[PDB]
Amino acid sequence: IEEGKLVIWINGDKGYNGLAEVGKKFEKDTGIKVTVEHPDKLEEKFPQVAATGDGPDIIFWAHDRFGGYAQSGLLAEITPDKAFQDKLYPFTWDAVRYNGKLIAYPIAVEALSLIYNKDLLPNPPKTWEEIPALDKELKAKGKSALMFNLQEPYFTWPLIAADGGYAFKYENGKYDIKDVGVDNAGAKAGLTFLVDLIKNKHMNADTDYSIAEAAFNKGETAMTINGPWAWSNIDTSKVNYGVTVLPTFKGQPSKPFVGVLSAGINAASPNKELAKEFLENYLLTDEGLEAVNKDKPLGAVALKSYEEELAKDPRIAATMENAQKGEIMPNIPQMSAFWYAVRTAVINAASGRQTVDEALKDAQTGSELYRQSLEIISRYLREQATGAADTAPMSGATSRKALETLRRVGDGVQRNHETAFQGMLRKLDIKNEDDVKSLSRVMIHVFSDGVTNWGRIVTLISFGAFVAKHLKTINQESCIEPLAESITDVLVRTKRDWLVKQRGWDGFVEFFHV
Amino acid sequence: SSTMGQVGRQLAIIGDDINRRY
Ligand SMILES: OC[C@H]1O[C@H](O[C@H]2[C@H](O)[C@@H](O)[C@@H](O)O[C@@H]2CO)[C@H](O)[C@@H](O)[C@@H]1O
């Protein structure tokens, strides 16, 4: 990471150009160049590169991912003095607090709202239950009632949560990670309603962010569900739109997750003090937040002074009304694995790969297996590639034994089958990031004859280590943990049942015992 | 079966050898 320079990562749907403009005012005053980037999958990439001491100086994401970052040592504790802390709303500081420390600067409060085309639908529905009849009416006219992103569970969560879904139970000052709330009647009722819309052809299971945004901004669909960042492209489209409270389901408010967009500082940055100066004295000011907001609306900002100025905006009022119906996201380190598991459940139910009930029943153990598997497999592939064991801490006994097993068994596979593994690598001709992403097709082919056993599982992880050694060799070391993640995904997404029956990683250690 | 299919199938054969061994 370059000293005397700031590199900032923010998601590509946010106002990164406005933020880069704030960066230019910083550079003007200081000589420090500010580079703003919007990598894909940055919320997964950031912990990967930061773990090796690289990556951006500053990372922007909703607050739900930062607990996991902090737990892994990847974030600097920030040090705002009392006067600065008083300039932002107290509940936004609460969102960026982890094990008693501030780990990020709060920027803005986000919640999803219903966005509707006033020319197609001046009186939008108050209930989800009305949408099928409305869609059938709009189809006779060449239109559709509603399109929104079905590939990210963030967007279906308001409906799942409406009748009782929840992520983790909060009781006695603590989230209880053993009490996950998607395998209950209300969550199932909400997701069933969503899958019925798809089954009856009011919705298409393949709809993603880009498709829904294009349809609404082209006036092809009467409604969408999206956050404040989306308002600016609608302005450009000259669709005449309103932003309103989400529909009710079984008479209950939709309950969107509330995110606080937050800016954390890399623990590996040599520019911590410059980062603090940029965030406190340039970004978190009326003029700094205005430049970002004019690019893509931020929502209800954390800075009291500027939020008072925008609060008259009726679109912000609707955001805050949906937010009050919803719930602030937990920030515990299990949130990443939760989202992995709920994303699979929603996509599986929507597509018919599983029933609604089976899909949500799997989610909890899927999240626990994912988290444990990802750590084991990622640690093995990294130590194989670098020659050095990771000293950071760890379900920890089992994960320690599993990794000891891999050093013996996985190393053994790579010894005995080196000639095969070398020809496989030559044949695949891995050069770049797309090459590595495409290996998920290899992994599925390992299991396509329908057989699963521990030997195939360990061989796939062993080949993953073999490929990872090669990736460091060609200066693509950052691709190692995406590889580990795709191996982990194939195993948990398609072999969850088998892993559970075989006692997971305890069974793995047992099977390969000397 | 194609190139990625061939690799994947050889990984399965190797895995079955390992499975039998252990
Ligand atoms: O879909 C799971 C996803 O939900 C949230 O991400 C939101 C984000 O908060 C919004 O700012 C916006 O970018 O859309 C994202 C959904 O695509 C969680 O914050 C994130 O951790 C989680 O993976």
Side-chain angles (χ1 to χ4, degrees), chain A residues 1-40 42-81 83-514, chain B:
Chain A
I1 307 187
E2 183 173 345
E3 193 163 340
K5 170 199 189 18
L6 285 178
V7 172
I8 300 181
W9 287 2
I10 180 161
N11 201 46
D13 50 6
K14 314 289 204 278
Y16 56 85
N17 288 99
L19 185 62
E21 280 169 28
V22 181
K24 295 308 211 59
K25 199 201 174 301
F26 191 76
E27 183 190 349
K28 175 160 151 296
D29 289 5
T30 73
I32 306 297
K33 265 163 223 194
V34 179
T35 301
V36 178
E37 300 175 348
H38 45 285
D40 299 337
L42 76 81
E43 78 282 10
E44 301 180 359
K45 298 219 184 297
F46 171 76
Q48 300 171 345
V49 303
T52 73
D54 309 326
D57 296 276
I58 298 174
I59 171 72
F60 280 82
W61 196 264
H63 73 281
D64 60 301
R65 297 258 171 186
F66 280 67
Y69 300 165
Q71 190 61 45
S72 302
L74 307 171
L75 292 174
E77 182 177 6
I78 61 157
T79 58
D81 58 28
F84 184 85
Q85 283 175 64
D86 295 334
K87 300 196 174 140
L88 311 195
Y89 287 102
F91 81 94
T92 64
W93 289 115
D94 291 331
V96 293
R97 201 164 300 109
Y98 182 72
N99 286 354
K101 296 144 228 296
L102 299 182
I103 53 165
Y105 283 92
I107 312 293
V109 177
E110 318 169 326
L112 294 170
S113 294
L114 185 71
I115 304 179
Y116 69 100
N117 180 329
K118 279 168 170 188
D119 295 335
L120 286 174
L121 193 63
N123 300 291
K126 290 294 177 41
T127 73
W128 281 95
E129 290 86 343
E130 296 164 69
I131 289 179
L134 180 59
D135 179 68
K136 181 162 172 72
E137 292 164 7
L138 287 161
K139 291 283 170 62
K141 254 194 85 148
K143 305 288 183 202
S144 71
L146 174 73
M147 302 180 50
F148 68 99
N149 190 0
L150 299 179
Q151 309 312 310
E152 282 295 339
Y154 180 74
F155 292 87
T156 58
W157 188 256
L159 176 61
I160 287 164
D163 194 34
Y166 61 88
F168 296 95
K169 198 65 131 298
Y170 190 92
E171 288 202 292
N172 305 296
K174 303 193 167 182
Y175 287 102
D176 179 3
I177 61 157
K178 290 117 90 163
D179 186 356
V180 188
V182 298
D183 186 19
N184 60 46
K188 290 156 178 180
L191 183 54
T192 297
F193 188 90
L194 180 83
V195 173
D196 286 347
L197 295 173
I198 293 162
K199 169 183 79 179
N200 296 320
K201 289 164 227 67
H202 307 314
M203 301 258 277
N204 184 317
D206 297 324
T207 296
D208 70 10
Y209 187 99
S210 291
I211 293 163
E213 180 179 39
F216 185 82
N217 293 0
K218 281 153 62 168
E220 300 171 359
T221 190
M223 303 179 281
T224 187
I225 296 176
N226 221 328
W229 54 86
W231 301 338
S232 165
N233 284 341
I234 310 176
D235 289 347
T236 299
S237 80
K238 302 175 174 183
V239 166
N240 299 111
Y241 70 99
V243 179
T244 193
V245 170
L246 290 160
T248 59
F249 176 60
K250 293 169 94 177
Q252 313 261 40
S254 293
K255 304 188 181 47
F257 261 138
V258 178
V260 182
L261 181 66
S262 306
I265 292 166
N266 202 333
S269 161
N271 304 295
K272 293 189 178 66
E273 268 311 299
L274 292 178
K276 169 172 173 155
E277 187 193 2
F278 173 79
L279 290 169
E280 285 189 18
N281 301 340
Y282 288 73
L283 180 58
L284 280 165
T285 70
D286 292 346
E287 63 263 33
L289 296 178
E290 176 172 280
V292 180
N293 199 68
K294 287 173 144 138
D295 187 8
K296 303 287 192 296
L298 285 165
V301 302
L303 186 69
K304 297 182 194 166
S305 68
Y306 192 52
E307 188 267 349
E308 265 142 44
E309 285 188 43
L310 303 181
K312 60 207 41 172
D313 188 332
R315 302 171 305 168
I316 297 294
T319 299
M320 291 313 300
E321 158 158 14
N322 285 309
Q324 302 255 34
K325 287 154 188 293
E327 309 297 340
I328 187 93
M329 281 181 293
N331 77 353
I332 58 177
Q334 293 77 17
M335 273 318 284
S336 53
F338 170 82
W339 282 126
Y340 169 82
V342 172
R343 178 184 301 117
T344 302
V346 170
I347 280 184
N348 278 2
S351 63
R353 285 192 268 269
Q354 294 182 279
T355 71
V356 166
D357 192 301
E358 293 164 338
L360 290 178
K361 173 271 193 76
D362 285 356
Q364 176 164 353
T365 62
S367 73
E368 304 167 333
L369 266 179
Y370 179 82
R371 175 163 158 98
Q372 189 182 29
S373 301
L374 182 58
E375 162 190 80
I376 293 163
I377 290 169
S378 291
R379 271 177 185 253
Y380 181 57
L381 264 60
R382 288 224 54 98
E383 87 174 38
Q384 284 282 301
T386 66
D390 194 349
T391 76
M394 303 278 232
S395 49
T398 297
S399 304
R400 159 162 82 260
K401 295 175 62 183
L403 202 57
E404 294 174 6
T405 298
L406 283 169
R407 286 162 185 146
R408 176 170 43 91
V409 180
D411 293 40
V413 177
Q414 293 179 75
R415 290 184 287 262
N416 204 97
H417 303 279
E418 175 172 283
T419 299
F421 278 15
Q422 286 173 340
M424 274 172 190
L425 192 58
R426 156 187 337 120
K427 199 147 101 140
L428 291 164
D429 192 12
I430 299 169
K431 289 166 139 163
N432 55 60
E433 202 182 345
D434 287 353
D435 293 355
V436 167
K437 196 184 316 324
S438 90
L439 294 176
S440 64
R441 185 199 168 175
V442 167
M443 313 170 195
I444 308 270
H445 277 296
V446 173
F447 301 102
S448 66
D449 71 355
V451 173
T452 301
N453 60 52
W454 284 122
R456 295 185 185 197
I457 286 156
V458 81
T459 294
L460 174 61
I461 296 164
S462 297
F463 187 67
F466 191 85
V467 172
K469 290 172 178 182
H470 172 72
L471 293 175
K472 187 163 180 58
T473 288
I474 71 183
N475 192 30
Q476 298 278 332
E477 180 175 359
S478 65
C479 287
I480 285 163
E481 293 188 354
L483 181 62
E485 195 281 325
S486 61
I487 293 170
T488 302
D489 171 51
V490 169
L491 299 181
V492 173
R493 177 164 47 69
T494 67
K495 304 300 176 266
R496 191 206 140 268
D497 289 4
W498 191 94
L499 291 167
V500 162
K501 183 186 147 236
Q502 294 308 319
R503 298 151 45 86
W505 288 103
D506 283 335
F508 172 88
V509 171
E510 219 186 295
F511 181 74
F512 286 116
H513 192 280
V514 173
Chain B
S1 65
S2 77
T3 292
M4 282 199 247
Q6 282 163 19
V7 170
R9 176 184 47 192
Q10 175 63 339
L11 288 170
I13 292 162
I14 291 166
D16 290 339
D17 188 9
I18 298 300
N19 201 58
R20 180 180 55 207
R21 169 180 168 178
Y22 292 91

